[PDB]
Amino acid sequence: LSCRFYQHKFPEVEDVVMVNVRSIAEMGAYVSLLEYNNIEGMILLSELSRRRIRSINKLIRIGRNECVVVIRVDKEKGYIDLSKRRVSPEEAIKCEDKFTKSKTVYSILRHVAEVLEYTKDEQLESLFQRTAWVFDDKYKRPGYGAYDAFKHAVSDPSILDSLDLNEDEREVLINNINRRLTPQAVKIRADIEVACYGYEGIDAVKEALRAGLNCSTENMPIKINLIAPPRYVMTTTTLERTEGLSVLSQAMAVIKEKIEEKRGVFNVQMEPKVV
Amino acid sequence: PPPLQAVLVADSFDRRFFPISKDQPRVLLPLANVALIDYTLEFLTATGVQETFVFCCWKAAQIKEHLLKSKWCRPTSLNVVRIITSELYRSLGDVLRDVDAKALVRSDFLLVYGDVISNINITRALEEHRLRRKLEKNVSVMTMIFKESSPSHPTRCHEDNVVVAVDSTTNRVLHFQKTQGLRRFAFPLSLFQGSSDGVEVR
Amino acid sequence: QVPTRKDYGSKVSLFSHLPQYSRQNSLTQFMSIPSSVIHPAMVRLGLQYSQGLVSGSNARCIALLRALQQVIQDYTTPPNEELSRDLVNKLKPYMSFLTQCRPLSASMHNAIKFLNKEITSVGSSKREEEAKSELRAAIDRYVQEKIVLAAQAISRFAYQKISNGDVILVYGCSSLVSRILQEAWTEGRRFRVVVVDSRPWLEGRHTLRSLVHAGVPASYLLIPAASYVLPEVSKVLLGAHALLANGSVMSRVGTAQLALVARAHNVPVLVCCETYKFCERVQTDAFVSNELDDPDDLQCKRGEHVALANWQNHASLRLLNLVYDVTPPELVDLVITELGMIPCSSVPVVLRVKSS
Amino acid sequence: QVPTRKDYGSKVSLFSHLPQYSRQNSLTQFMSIPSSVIHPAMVRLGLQYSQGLVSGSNARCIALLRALQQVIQDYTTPPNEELSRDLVNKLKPYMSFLTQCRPLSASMHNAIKFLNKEITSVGSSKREEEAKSELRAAIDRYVQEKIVLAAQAISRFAYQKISNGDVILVYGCSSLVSRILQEAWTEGRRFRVVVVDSRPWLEGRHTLRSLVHAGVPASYLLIPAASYVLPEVSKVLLGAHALLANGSVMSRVGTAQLALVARAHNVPVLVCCETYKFCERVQTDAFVSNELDDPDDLQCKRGEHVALANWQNHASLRLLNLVYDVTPPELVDLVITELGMIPCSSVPVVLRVKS
Amino acid sequence: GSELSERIESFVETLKRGGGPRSSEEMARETLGLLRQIITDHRWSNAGELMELIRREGRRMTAAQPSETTVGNMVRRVLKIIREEYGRLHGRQQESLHKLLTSEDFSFHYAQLQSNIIEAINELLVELEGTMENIAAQALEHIHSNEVIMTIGFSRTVEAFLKEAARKRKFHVIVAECAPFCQGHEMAVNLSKAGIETTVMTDAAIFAVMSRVNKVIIGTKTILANGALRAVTGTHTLALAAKHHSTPLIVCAPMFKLSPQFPNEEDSFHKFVAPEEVLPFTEGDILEKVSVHCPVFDYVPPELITLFISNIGGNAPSYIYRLMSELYHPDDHVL
């Protein structure tokens, strides 16, 4: 029960690919292209490193995933020639990201096929062809297109409605997409010690706390609570932690300005951070 | 838990070093070409202390000047040192009263003197103290550190020799006294009424 | 496919990790007469390895390379395949069968590695006939420059050490030592040779006959009596089946003993070997890697009775027939190669300069 | 009959022929409280042997001889019996019990042989109290002239080998070495001593304390670091539990190792031993004859855990602590005896002139 | 920037105060990562300036703890990598007679240099991943059936060696505890959990038991220029006993433990620690007059070593001079 991650059965010249080493030979290293349904490949002895290499075991470490570009492809003999000395870190990291998103797509579609109890691999191939490759061709970008399409369809299932698989199949796919790729939950917490030893001490502290809490945006209520008599804690479970940290920093700055205006003292015990 | 803190009393409120201490504080006396304050600061830093308070009264200017040029006052030091001076200090009790007055500490700080040579890591002792405090709900107030030794060692001076009666199963101090000039030690019976199961005299 | 040869008798507990066969048991009794799985040339080569018709390391390497040239000549590339990989994949079972017939030697291992490298380097865009001809020519050049010219150079180098009126002690049978002695005698050196032999092969009679036919005065004795003749021996010249990367010399079973006894009598030790027998592996004893010959070869007739006739009946009785030993580098003075006269510790250095 | 002591734990395959007991398990659990089968002095001596209260070879021999004197004092010959062989027959089970408590040492073996020869030599016409008094006096004289006078003579002989400003390396604890060093310091020689110790007994602290109390400068280190201090060491002075007929020196486990490392550093080796510890037996290694101590003594607390706590749970794990080892005669330069300074190969000669 | 300096301070403080990282492999990995960060997160114009910066950082790190030679080895490996890259990308060594008979500057910034260097470092890190497995894979060609192996102390490389060998053969292993830090107990119990039939003894019985030992397999802390070893204490005695009985002594050590220094720095060679382990503080007054020394390392001459097993295979101690000539440059020895 397996299928290719992309529509092409064989990679084209100069495509950076994930491989998994399985043995060693005189020519080089046998591998299996993971996203091409475990077809065997070859990393040549003469392309392992830019420098002078002594042995195969120096760098291969059989049993480990590796990011290798391809130079020569021969489909009639099933010969695919790879190379490591030509890849670069940027290509390596983008290949890893592309591979992991394609793996997530394959995992969700395999789960759909399993929950629909398709024993034959041809049925799984048909399901993977109807949904993934349609969007991949529509966006003209293999790998990226499918993952982006499911990410968009997790919120609005209108795109997934155009699929012509089935009603139960569509329901299962929607449920899997909404239960797998919708982990939107983040908490930003901070601690601030603000107090004023003035005439209206408690009043100024309450006013500063209210002014800080008023800066809370929609779907992000800053639940300020008193941890210790001199120190309060701001906690807010809001997604998009990149914006949450900025919101917490702005609220802390506003509270500090309000406290300093009321002739008081304020300090930041702990900066905003995730839970 | 908050970062570990430490109160470092940089002035011994007793004159055991006349006339040497009349022109140089005992804290700045070179032991092995290195001042005692450096040794105790290194001990505090190596054991995980992240904030240190030095309370120096006698010749506090020299101590301040020496500390400011030391390694621990650099911006790269993980042990932040705060220098507080006052001419009104007369004893360690005054230092602790000032600490409570200004509320320097929040929980489970370290009390050491400015002339302590050590390499002790207090991680296990601190964990035991915190666990005991959590289980007993704020009953254990202090955990004193002792070193296994022999009465005949040169380090065991007659002045600071101490005999301690403890509960062997919970490491609780039940009685504590100094043996300066005493040829015979005495222990009250009230020790044995509570922890009759086990009592040790060390 | 080809089955596995059956172990014969009971092995020593310390040598239980090595295969031990019998000469009577042949692996070809379970293979088709017009052999298909194994090439007929390889079948004949394995048959004459197992029966002992080819013994010397140089002879074994030459026979392997000849049979391998025949295999390459008969080889035809399958459709929809590449020669540079199919040839190696086809050759591997032949090597496994040859190992089953008799464990491979260092020279054969080096030759196999050389041919694997040569085949791997064959271009994918060249004609089959050209590739086959180039492989045959490469095998011929390897044989020439690694045996013939090497032996000539080693003889020329060893002519310097051999002086007039000295005594040279040789052990076992080796073509290099015999050629060195014969050439030295031809050029005008006058000397004696003492031949040391050992059971059960008794292959020192080959070099004894060669020296007698060459006209060199010779003496013959068994190895236990070696300590008797070393007082009048001036040099100990030995042949090596392999040189290891740590300097240790792998050779016949008695060789190391001689070196030791030579060290007891203050006699210089020379080892002559060709550089293609240099091995990058290392071993410190004759236990981790060796070959157990037929135990029944240890039986000897002393009078009218054979003591070890039915040795299988005694359950606690074991026989081992070792064929190799390892000599530490501190018991060897000279190594004579086609590169020149080197110390015993320069073996890796040569291995470094022959690989680049 | 005295029950057979049970072996504790699993032994090494190469040492399966040697007994291995546990310090906690004693024979007296299966013995009458008022000792009847064996003399109370003998059971007391066996208990203090097994628990380790008597360790030194000379101390063990002296304690055994005192216990034997106590046994002889209370001995009463049965009617229609002769003392000469009845006493030996009575003593044999005592020796068996003592061997059960802990294997006998060379000094104890020689003392037993001497006492048996003395008892056999007692005439039949001798009257009981005179024979007992003669045996007691013979035991006392043997102790005197074989320990005290021998140690004095050896200390006098070793005074000439010790010069001013030299370094002497000693191993373990032995009364002879300590006496030699203290007397040499008293006479006026000035030197240093280096004390080498080994686990688990750690008995070098005894001689370290003795040297400190005597005033001799001393250094302390464990056996693995010995190869570090031998560059500055001038002589290696060792004590011997026994000298064998082939010249081999049987001693504590690290003695032969120290001799080998000292030979590697070109340091002379002196061995001090009394002629009553010379044995007619020979052995070429520490395997054929040795003693296995309690394996649980090897457990040590490093940090907060004992790595070998439940070592018997692991089926394939064995613990080995030898008690003695054998130094070949070629690693020893001097043997200092009351007869003088002799080569290591003259041990049988002494054995020839002492009988 | 600031984070790089903070990491450098943390590394040097961890080095000079106590342990960390636990394993030598992890320490080498951390050193290489720190060197990579220094190369990237810092501005240098010429290759010589980068070499000077690396020299300063390596000098500080080695002065933090001279006994940890792996940091210096990584620094010198990085310097050699820089030299090789500059020479290859600028023009086209090792002071031989050939160069003397047939007859430099490190200026001239080239843009392609830096990235290349990084790649090389990554390659280095790659061979740090499979080094232990590479060493262990060749254990079956050195252990035969019913052999008697002897080991001193705790070594992860030797542990992997024996655990891989035990999957197909039965043999006996004796472990001598390395007093005072009896770390041999941990290795003994670890081997016993694998059913290797292990025996434990104190390291005072090395000579007595060597007569029945077939092979000695040990680890090491540092391999010196002439093939000598800086090993745990008691290893010199073990080697002496093995040489006396002519039992081969195998050293299983990776290639990053090779240090181009010679044993003439005897003063800092051993690491002397508190004498509490040897003689406890509870002894009393005798501690006033007694000198106690507790070295944890000792020097083993190359003549007592039979073989060197590393991730590149087997070698003799006579070949070590070549290996370092392929790893470090002669001008980088002093650093």
Numbering used by the authors:
A (entry chain N): 3 to 277
B (entry chain J): 40 to 241
C (entry chain G): 166 to 521
D (entry chain H): 166 to 520
E (entry chain C): 8 to 99, 105 to 115, 120 to 351
Could you share sentences copied from the article?
Most of the ternary complex particles contained only one molecule of eIF2, but small fractions of those containing two eIF2 molecules were also observed. These structures revealed that SFSV NSs and the unphosphorylated eIF2 can bind to eIF2B simultaneously and there is no direct interaction between them. The only exception is the quite small closure of the interface for unphosphorylated eIF2, as observed in the comparison of the eIF2B•unphosphorylated eIF2 complex structure with the eIF2B apo structure.
After the recognition, eIF2 is released from the ribosomes as the guanosine disphosphate (GDP)-bound form and regenerated by its specific guanine nucleotide exchange factor, eIF2B, a heterodecameric complex of two copies each of the α-, β-, γ-, δ-, and ε-subunits. Sandfly fever Sicilian virus (SFSV) evades this cap-dependent translation suppression through the interaction between its nonstructural protein NSs and host eIF2B. Here, our cryo-electron microscopy (cryo-EM) analysis reveals that SFSV NSs binds to the α-subunit of eIF2B in a competitive manner with eIF2(αP).
